[PDB]
């Protein structure tokens, strides 16, 4: 059975939009602020993946053993309806 995982990060912005955010810079425990633009209000950016399993346990594992293989952590929300986990 296949479940979902939404990995999100925080953003702040203001055609041209200017934004900044904190990012991992070599090491899980270390972050750094950065600027970025395109061509003042809070925001959130999300990438989604789906590892296939059988229950909402193994999923919870693989999804924790993925935030492991990356500098990901934070709060975890779960909607059973869409089987969606949400790290932030």
């Amino acid at each position: 059975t296949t479940f979902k995982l939404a990995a999100c990060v925080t953003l702040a912005c203001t055609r041209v939009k200017h934004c900044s955010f904190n990012i991992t810079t070599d090491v899980k425990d270390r972050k750094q602020k950065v600027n970025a633009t395109f061509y003042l209000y809070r925001l959130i950016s999300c990438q989604t993946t789906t590892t296939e399993a059988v229950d909402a346990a193994t999923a919870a594992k693989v999804f924790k053993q993925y935030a492991n293989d990356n500098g990901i952590d934070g709060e975890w929300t779960y909607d059973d309806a869409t089987k969606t986990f949400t790290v932030t």
Partner: antibody
Amino acid sequence: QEQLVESGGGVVQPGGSLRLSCLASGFTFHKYGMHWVRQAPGKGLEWVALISDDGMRKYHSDSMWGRVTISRDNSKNTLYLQFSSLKVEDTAMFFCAREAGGPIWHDDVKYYDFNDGYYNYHYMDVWGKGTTVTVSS
Amino acid sequence: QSALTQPASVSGSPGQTITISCQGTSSDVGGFDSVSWYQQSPGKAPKVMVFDVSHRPSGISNRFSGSKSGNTASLTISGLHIEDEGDYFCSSLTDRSHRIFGGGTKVTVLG
């Protein structure tokens, strides 16, 4: 062995100019912002100027603005203070002090500023001996 | 550009508790939790005793403590030792990212 050593102090005439310097050692100079603080004979400490680690942002007190310029040369661990249009009143001991700083902790993750730069902790954790500047006619 | 206001002079016996106040404005002391206190011993350079209102750097005795209320901050030394003698200066971050110091307080440990 964090150490700061000021020099260049001496006698100047009002209206004139003079450059002070502060030699740093015992720590990574270019990671820390730096202050100048003066103390007139028998008076209290008075903040003069602050310059960011990379030397791109400068701040000068309102009472000395126009008579001071702060700068630094990270390639030789030195902080400078350029005087001009000096007043008799500017006579004082000038101190070189380091701005405490580093990452900001939220959980177990260290957050650094633009270009992995330290945030300021808003206190001075290293001071020099100070050098005397005498403005006299 | 006018310094923070402190009492010119205070004193107490060894082992006595004393407090020094630091009067400011909403643009400095009452605008941030960034009040630091420095001690200046005769001959020596200044030295941080308390930062961020009530925090102590590594090495400083628990005797020293600070608090803040509105536009005034305070440093308390509960149990004066002889080495506490000297001049004390409060300091605050400003809303313009400057620093401003208080006029200074002479602390005498009655001997």
